[PDB]
């Protein structure tokens, strides 16, 4: 993480026979690697792009190339439902244990 | 376990859901898949040398 020059690394990545690339890193690291890939024609056709939640947004979202297919969790922020379900499960566990 | 995810297709810097992962399968939506290089047809990444 936080490397300043991995252009050659993406070069041997393109040296590989396959044309499928997948990423898992931090927001800033993803932004840097997206900049490197865009400046080295690594975002071209054929190179399908699948990435994780940590890099479909944040700093990398600006330099995100076209055609990115991202994933996310539905209602991953609505805390009221989360805490209600947690209260339900913990109360059920406490009741069943003390019984 | 069995978390149901959703997949987003970057349609001109926009958030569009093109499928839901039901925990065992990814059922896609009607929207086409926008691929890198501005393509809507599926590229297969196994090109020979």
């Amino acid at each position, epitope marked *: 993480p936080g490397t300043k020059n991995v252009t050659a690394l993406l070069m041997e990545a393109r040296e590989l026979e396959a044309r499928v690339i997948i990423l898992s890193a931090s*927001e800033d690291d993803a932004a840097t690697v997206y900049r490197a890939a*865009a400046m080295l024609n690594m975002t071209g056709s054929g190179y399908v792009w699948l990435v994780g939640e940590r890099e479909i*947004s*944040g*700093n990398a*979202l*600006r330099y995100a*190339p076209d055609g990115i297919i991202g994933l996310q969790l539905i209602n991953g922020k*609505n805390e009221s439902a989360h805490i209600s379900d947690a209260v339900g499960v913990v109360a059920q566990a406490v009741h069943e244990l003390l019984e | 376990k069995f978390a149901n995810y959703s997949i987003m297709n970057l349609q001109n*810097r926009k958030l569009v859901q093109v499928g839901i992962y039901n925990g065992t399968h990814v059922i896609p939506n009607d929207r086409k898949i926008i691929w890198p290089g501005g393509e809507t047809e599926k590229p297969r990444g196994y090109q020979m040398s």
Partner: antibody
Amino acid sequence: DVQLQESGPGLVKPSQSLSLTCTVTGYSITSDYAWNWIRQFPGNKLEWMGYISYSGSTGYNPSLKSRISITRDTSKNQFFLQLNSVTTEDTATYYCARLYYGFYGMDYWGQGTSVTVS
Amino acid sequence: IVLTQSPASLAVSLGQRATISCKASQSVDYDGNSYMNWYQQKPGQPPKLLIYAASNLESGIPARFSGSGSGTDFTLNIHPVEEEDAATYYCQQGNEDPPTFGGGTKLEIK
């Protein structure tokens, strides 16, 4: 629907720090995003000061970072712009706008508040 | 490194195309994408984003507004034109720092 409101002291006795308040009701505050401060002069021209996300990323002008403070209030998660000195003559309008990341999509805009530098 | 809009007070009539030239000194086009935004304003009125990317439809307004060009030059094309379009229109880049104001040309009606 999602609503936002901007307010501030505007003008009190001189040699003080403006704390312009921006908040959003009807929507989550700290999921993703860009939050930009915008300054406009009655000469009909715009310019940029700074952006803050929920990602924690911040970005400001190198020449304007001297007396700008972006502070948190947690009870509703509203953000405050602290800047020194308020007057009347240098009447300019200020906006707080949440927007799609990358300075790309200006989803929302501010209503404008009277801030002066003189 | 100046960014301009042409012209400040242009002749705008009804039915034809209106050409606003957003000249940005920098090379906007990044990885095949030119980050343009066009928005309207009135003095003291909250701005509202009219069109984004110059080629993607904005929800609420038909194809009367569009944007062409590349790199150094861009063009807001109003085809056709209506009467209430009289406002301070601003073109804004979105590639990277610096976020630079456009000409903010005001649309006058003949």
